[PDB]
Scaffold this active site. Structure first.
Site, short mmCIF file in Angstrom:
data_model
loop_
_atom_site.label_atom_id
_atom_site.label_comp_id
_atom_site.label_asym_id
_atom_site.label_seq_id
_atom_site.Cartn_x
_atom_site.Cartn_y
_atom_site.Cartn_z
N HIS A 11 -0.56 6.60 1.83
CA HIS A 11 -0.54 5.32 1.21
C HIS A 11 -2.33 5.04 0.68
O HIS A 11 -2.43 4.15 -0.17
CB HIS A 11 -0.30 4.16 1.63
CG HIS A 11 1.23 4.15 2.02
ND1 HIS A 11 1.67 4.54 3.52
CD2 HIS A 11 2.62 4.30 1.37
CE1 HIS A 11 2.87 4.63 3.46
NE2 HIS A 11 3.57 4.56 2.58
N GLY A 27 -4.67 -9.83 -1.56
CA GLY A 27 -3.05 -9.37 -1.89
C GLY A 27 -3.18 -8.50 -3.20
O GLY A 27 -2.66 -7.14 -3.24
N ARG A 31 -7.51 -8.19 -8.05
CA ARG A 31 -8.59 -9.01 -7.54
C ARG A 31 -9.87 -8.26 -6.85
O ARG A 31 -10.83 -8.36 -6.86
CB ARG A 31 -7.88 -10.11 -6.63
CG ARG A 31 -9.01 -10.85 -5.96
CD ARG A 31 -8.34 -12.16 -5.69
NE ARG A 31 -8.16 -13.09 -6.73
CZ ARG A 31 -7.93 -14.49 -6.81
NH1 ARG A 31 -7.75 -15.14 -5.41
NH2 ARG A 31 -7.63 -15.21 -7.81
N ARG A 50 -0.41 4.21 -5.52
CA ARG A 50 0.64 3.30 -5.92
C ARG A 50 -0.06 1.79 -6.93
O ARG A 50 0.43 0.80 -6.64
CB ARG A 50 1.32 2.72 -4.84
CG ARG A 50 2.49 3.66 -4.13
CD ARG A 50 2.77 3.13 -2.57
NE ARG A 50 3.77 4.28 -2.21
CZ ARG A 50 5.10 4.02 -2.18
NH1 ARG A 50 5.68 2.88 -3.15
NH2 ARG A 50 5.80 5.17 -1.95
N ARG A 94 -9.42 -11.07 5.34
CA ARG A 94 -8.58 -11.36 4.41
C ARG A 94 -8.88 -12.20 3.72
O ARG A 94 -9.39 -13.32 4.15
CB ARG A 94 -6.96 -11.56 4.76
CG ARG A 94 -5.97 -12.25 3.92
CD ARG A 94 -4.43 -12.14 4.23
NE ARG A 94 -4.06 -13.18 3.42
CZ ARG A 94 -3.78 -13.21 2.04
NH1 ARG A 94 -4.18 -12.26 1.40
NH2 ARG A 94 -3.24 -14.34 1.73
N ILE A 95 -9.17 -12.12 2.09
CA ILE A 95 -9.33 -13.10 1.32
C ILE A 95 -8.11 -13.66 0.52
O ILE A 95 -7.87 -13.19 -0.44
CB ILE A 95 -10.55 -12.58 0.32
CG1 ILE A 95 -10.58 -11.04 0.23
CG2 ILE A 95 -11.92 -13.00 1.38
CD1 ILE A 95 -11.41 -10.87 -0.90
N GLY A 96 -7.71 -14.68 0.78
CA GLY A 96 -6.21 -14.93 0.17
C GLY A 96 -6.02 -16.26 -0.33
O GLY A 96 -7.28 -16.99 -0.37
N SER A 97 -4.94 -16.82 -0.77
CA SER A 97 -4.51 -17.96 -1.25
C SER A 97 -3.53 -18.48 -0.20
O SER A 97 -2.51 -17.93 0.15
CB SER A 97 -4.25 -17.82 -2.57
OG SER A 97 -3.21 -17.19 -2.90
N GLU A 186 1.64 -18.83 3.51
CA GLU A 186 1.18 -17.70 2.82
C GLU A 186 1.93 -16.31 3.46
O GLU A 186 3.09 -16.79 4.09
CB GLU A 186 -0.40 -17.39 2.86
CG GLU A 186 -1.07 -17.20 4.16
CD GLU A 186 -0.81 -15.91 4.59
OE1 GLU A 186 -1.57 -15.12 4.02
OE2 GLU A 186 -0.28 -15.89 5.81
N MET A 187 1.61 -15.31 3.24
CA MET A 187 2.45 -14.20 3.70
C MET A 187 1.60 -12.98 4.46
O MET A 187 2.62 -12.21 5.19
CB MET A 187 3.07 -13.30 2.43
CG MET A 187 3.99 -14.37 1.53
SD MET A 187 4.72 -13.82 0.09
CE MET A 187 6.28 -12.96 0.97
N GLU A 188 0.39 -12.82 4.78
CA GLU A 188 0.07 -11.81 5.29
C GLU A 188 -1.15 -11.95 6.51
O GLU A 188 -1.19 -10.79 7.15
CB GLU A 188 -0.93 -10.65 4.24
CG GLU A 188 0.13 -10.31 3.27
CD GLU A 188 -0.08 -11.32 1.95
OE1 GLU A 188 -0.67 -12.06 1.88
OE2 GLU A 188 0.94 -11.19 1.21
N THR A 210 -4.95 -23.09 -3.34
CA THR A 210 -4.56 -22.97 -4.72
C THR A 210 -3.48 -23.79 -5.21
O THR A 210 -3.36 -23.94 -6.53
CB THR A 210 -4.51 -21.36 -5.26
OG1 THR A 210 -3.43 -21.02 -4.58
CG2 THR A 210 -5.80 -20.85 -4.73
N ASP A 211 -2.55 -23.97 -4.28
CA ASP A 211 -1.28 -24.82 -4.92
C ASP A 211 -1.08 -25.85 -3.86
O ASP A 211 -1.02 -25.62 -2.59
CB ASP A 211 -0.28 -23.77 -5.10
CG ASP A 211 -0.68 -22.84 -6.33
OD1 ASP A 211 -0.36 -23.04 -7.37
OD2 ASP A 211 -1.21 -21.59 -5.79
N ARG A 224 -9.04 -21.37 -10.09
CA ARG A 224 -8.90 -20.26 -9.20
C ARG A 224 -10.18 -19.36 -9.15
O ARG A 224 -10.59 -19.12 -8.27
CB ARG A 224 -7.59 -19.64 -9.79
CG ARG A 224 -6.34 -20.57 -9.38
CD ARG A 224 -5.02 -20.13 -9.92
NE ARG A 224 -4.07 -21.27 -9.88
CZ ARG A 224 -3.05 -21.42 -8.96
NH1 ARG A 224 -2.92 -20.63 -8.33
NH2 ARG A 224 -2.35 -22.42 -9.21
#
Lengths: 244, 244, 244, 244, 244, 244
Positions: A11, A27, A31, A50, A94-97, A186-188, A210-211, A224
């Site tokens: 990958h 993610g 970005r 991918r 990790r730089i996430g929302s 969030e998810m990760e 963000t939400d 954002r």
């Protein structure tokens, strides 16, 4: 040593030497590209399998990588595994929302995740159906807070919930999460902290609110952008303070 | 207001005003007594139901409490619940012991628990069978590390495993715990951090490595006394730095 | 043979010969002391680690022990394990209290527990996630009933529910328990019966209905004293009828 | 009242008044027929849906029923439900066979089941994923033992394991069962005791050790006949002692 | 070779050569008898242990068997195991009935089961607590549909839910089943498809909608006879098209 | 109607009318692009959020879409949900790859998935911890087989296992999968079939055996190209046969 000269992973199509010791991962691979092109000098795109773009460049004389991990624990875990083993990356931000689930947490708050609850079965599978505590590296957590103390960012240090489910029938489980101290969804993050535990790597996660799921409010696109900038300025500052 | 004047709980017989904002809790009520009598001034024994001794006194001009929580999540959770609700205690430092499960962790190391894995079903019951991340309050965690940096104590900041089982058939699960970063095994940290999350209270846990399960080595009784002293000097220093 | 002469366990500081074949165990070590001092002759306090007091004395010419087990399955299981192995105690009578969950069960009823449901994960862990039936020794169960038939005690022979949770959000699960025949709720019977099964030991539990959770009624302190006396008179009578 | 005059259930075609207060149930409907025809007077076949034969007759002046329940918890539970509700049967004696899993239990032993472990999910579904203790009615258990004491039958009073699985890859789980006190393995006792708990009915189970799974030994056909006779003589004696 | 000449199984008393390659199985052994006697030529009853009748005869020159499997996964699995191993039967058509749970599915619809959800723990036990997809053999599924296309039967090809529970407190779980596409509820399809997967055998299931659980409507006895006939005409047509 | 004119989803930036009724989805968005650009006429790229490219064009006069779903159930489920709701796509063909786990399955075999086992908790969460059978739409399954019968492709119709885990410690679980009929291992088929069940959509999955996990063999890059072509020729042929 051709086998090693040409080594890569299913990958990631980077040569083995292509990544820095420290990587920032959102993610979204686009970005990652925006970040690398905006903040880094001497940038090379090192992988694109991918469409999961990764980059290596320099910030204030230090090598830094930036790469997307995709959505959800199973996608993110694949990239974490390959980076932490084959490519020998040590430090992960990790730089996430995330989405807030209680009025006490506000849009534009920056959550520094000490830990991450989850509804994934992945840890139960690997950990004999025990409850695995997925937590941050202390030194990176502390560096984040020490940088944040020098800013005007409203930040919170606590727990997130990493779900396999973006879409849910109703907000009942969200109210339960808030009852027990969850700051955002969030998810990760759980996957990152769990992979880092397995591989003796160091990880932390920052998640912009963000939400607001409970309040039904959302940052504008421009807002954002602003909050992304705040988070990246913090993350790069932390990366520079990590040992080499 | 007689009903409130005489209010207590089924497991604590203290008047409502009897505890400090900050409490140190070992498992052993006789250790709580030793601590209070050794380190605190103007000590009062405030509770003794079931022999679960608790005390309130002063250290360097600050009110401090010390009380036993008993063994295991269900015992500890009862006292945490009653203290965090009825008695309005805010800050909790578990002062514990743990067994190491890998040669990299040494006898006399002091583990500062960022998080706690578990094999209890209690969180699954309350949290819709999700994985609850039981983690420390950041500010208390950081204060612990900042105090420890001023000492010669060998300390580690990471995860413990809180088990319902003291006795197990073999060391196979212990090797799995070590594979995924667990530093030591004990019984009440997960319960403390989970109760603190429910009740908006602040918690951290220090655990001396008093026994090495994998290496089959044990501190002497005198060595346990020495390391207890190191941990209490740290805990009291942290208590003094917490807001009032 | 110094190693054996000085042998003890981490939670019991008695010499190896110190216990009787038969032990009465309440949760509360101070209740164990009250019982030993009230009913037994030639009493010796044989253990006091962590304040978990145990005693050995004689009743009507038979050696009897009495000791506290603490609260909850993980605490109780430790003492059961150590007593049933190291100290070779054979017969166990838990002398407990429980909360009723349906108006058909009355304050002052004495429940003789044939079995114990639970919400602990401990048996699932040891028993390949099967449902373990935690039940009493028949001979001890029958001796209890045969003694009770000679009294004016209102007794019931059926199942209890042993929970890890003293505090719960509401009474919904209690109504489900009652729907399926549960007579009262407490915390250590399942652990006793499970440990006894593992160790080829013989166990039974008596639980006074001291509180009615559904009806919101409670025995007075004096009433608790009265019903304790009834239960101890029964337990000692049963102990005297057991083989030697 | 035609609707009630003609009332039956989907799996039983008996009129509502057709059963006794007390029923003996083997798995095999042909065994039910053999029992009724051998031991009962004035026998009527009252049901035959799906070949699941049931009978009502008299023994020593008392009405007694006998009926097959089929194999496994889901089959048995259907008949138990319909008998305990629609047909208002109160007392149930399962007359079964089991396989032994340890050399201490012998071919021809008669197990009187105090309780039944299981690997079914049915109780978890109905009981909020708690561990349901499936146990016998004490009075019926005691009557069984009191009858058995007057015989030369080698009997044991303890726990069985009720499995959904007749066929398994190996004997590993059987050794675990024996480690924790299981005396024999069969398929319907847990379901009987659980249905009886739900429906306020009274149940007990007798299981002849007809096969030794661990020792690989089996009763002959003639030996099975002999031991059936012993069990039925006991069961009918118990039925006669139950209140009317 | 007497041992093999006399070989049978504990639940089937047929000689080893007694079954066809293809078997039709309803739950009800009396239905198996009705089918064999109505549709087959040169019929022999080959087994009758526990009243679980099985038959072998000929249809249009092909050998066909018909036998009851009893109610529920544990009963059905025993017969499937013994037939697929000892008796070397290859092809299995379950000829069943089911209850509909949504007004879109109608009384007299014939469900051809592609798959079967379940609430049994049997597959979790054998499959390391993963979710086992229990599905039909494609060739048999397709043959069913190709036969059905030549009829006036209203048929549906989709999923059933195989439950251990015939009786449930309310219809809430039934509404959830319908939300996710379940067409009808019965008890043995999942077991058939799972056993067939284990044993490299070929299986399909047809289930007449004889009852509408949601609408509270039921086929008359005569209507059940009619729809049975439709299903058997289809099943025999499929059997004739299978390779030999 | 500006709100609807401008409507999109958080992960897809296409206008509402942009997709065909039928969509082909590989994991890899770059493969989606290769497919659209190679096989479709009049192609428009309709979405590119997070690099997750989607396209709509025509094949032999029919509108067809092609889009990546990313890796793993949680990523794939997001796109399936948004496509099946907001964008009203009806028919879904996953065009995937899988790893074989037994020598009977060969490199270059094409698996047509009737069903998909899994180790995800997502269905357990939504389906009250029952086992959800995730299966294909029959008509699409049959169309696949009818097209394949006109080719020289070696195909198999059976079950896949959709795992959250790409990386595992060893091949033990793979041998268990093969024991129970699993033909190959991948990550998104169960999610597709489950989402399609929820949303009344029609789905099937084709998976090329590109890797043999048990045999340790792998298709070359060129061989992967060849087998991709075979699968796309089949998928497009099936799409053309679906109703409009």
């Amino acid at each position: 040593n051709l086998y090693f000269q040409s080594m890569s992973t299913p990958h990631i199509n980077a040569p083995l030497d292509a990544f820095a010791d420290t990587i920032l991962m959102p993610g979204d691979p686009l970005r990652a590209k925006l970040i690398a092109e905006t903040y880094l000098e001497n940038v090379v795109q090192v992988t694109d399998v991918r469409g999961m773009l990764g980059f290596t460049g320099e910030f204030k004389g230090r090598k830094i990588s930036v790469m997307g991990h995709g959505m959800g624990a199973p996608s993110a875990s694949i990239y974490f595994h390959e980076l932490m083993t084959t490519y020998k990356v040590k430090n992960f931000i990790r730089i996430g929302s995330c989405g807030a689930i209680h009025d006490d947490v506000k849009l534009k708050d920056l959550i520094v995740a000490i830990g991450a609850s989850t509804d994934s079965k992945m840890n139960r599978i690997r950990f004999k159906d025990n409850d695995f505590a997925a937590t941050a590296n202390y030194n990176m957590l502390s560096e984040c807070v020490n940088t944040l103390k020098t800013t005007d960012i409203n930040y919170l240090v606590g727990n997130v919930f990493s779900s396999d489910l973006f879409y849910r029938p109703d907000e009942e489980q969200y109210d339960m999460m808030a009852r027990y101290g969850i700051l955002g969804v969030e998810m990760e993050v759980n996957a990152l902290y769990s992979a880092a535990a397995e591989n003796h790597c160091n990880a932390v996660a920052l998640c912009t609110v963000t939400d607001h799921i409970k309040n039904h409010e959302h940052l504008t696109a421009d807002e954002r952008r602003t909050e992304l900038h705040e988070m990246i300025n913090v993350a790069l500052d932390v990366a520079l303070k990590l040992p080499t």
